[PDB]
Chain A
């Protein structure tokens, strides 16, 4: 039945009222996974943030913190603008924790993962970025309490040799500048108040 309701999401708006009634019934019944799928469908009909959050939660199979169903009970078309303060914090913290756990897993499997990503991001970055100070240690013990902990900073006067993994031809300086300008303009379309172009000006 609910799967057919998914087609109603892709169909015309005549079944939306029936879809709203089905969503209300599901909220009353307190569905676990079908509620997530219906939330994804409804929040893909209007906006995308709540839908993708519900889909990501279903992918991690988040059984606990089932406040999304409470969000699914909101009368503003089975959703709500300016989402509940409980769900918003829950969604943000869940996203951040998933990212941190994935980073930890990848770093444990491949110790060079973070180093490779940082080097790739710093390869074409402006020189001032590459002179950023190194991260310090926040650990405790004899050091930082009785002794002294020396920093991890280095000279950071480095040369980046960028080689394509597949052997394809790399973009020249003019092509890289054109791509950078294109993306900066596209982001200016997204963000009217941003100083990204200033970074494009190389500090």
Chain B
């Protein structure tokens, strides 16, 4: 359940044995969340609404940087 963007970054992360170490490559692998979208009026308003909703719903999710269900780790690799 990964994408091409994550896999391209995954091959180049070598000499990694434990998920703890791979936990330090979290925002680097978070770049697989490109969410490519235009900057039109509808998309810009939608982008603002969606990113604000993601910020507030990550507050209620309240997961630490160790437990990241939505950022693929050593299992997928």
A/B: CB atoms within 8 Å of each other: no
A interface residues with partner B (beta carbon < 8 Å): none
B interface residues with partner A (beta carbon < 8 Å): none
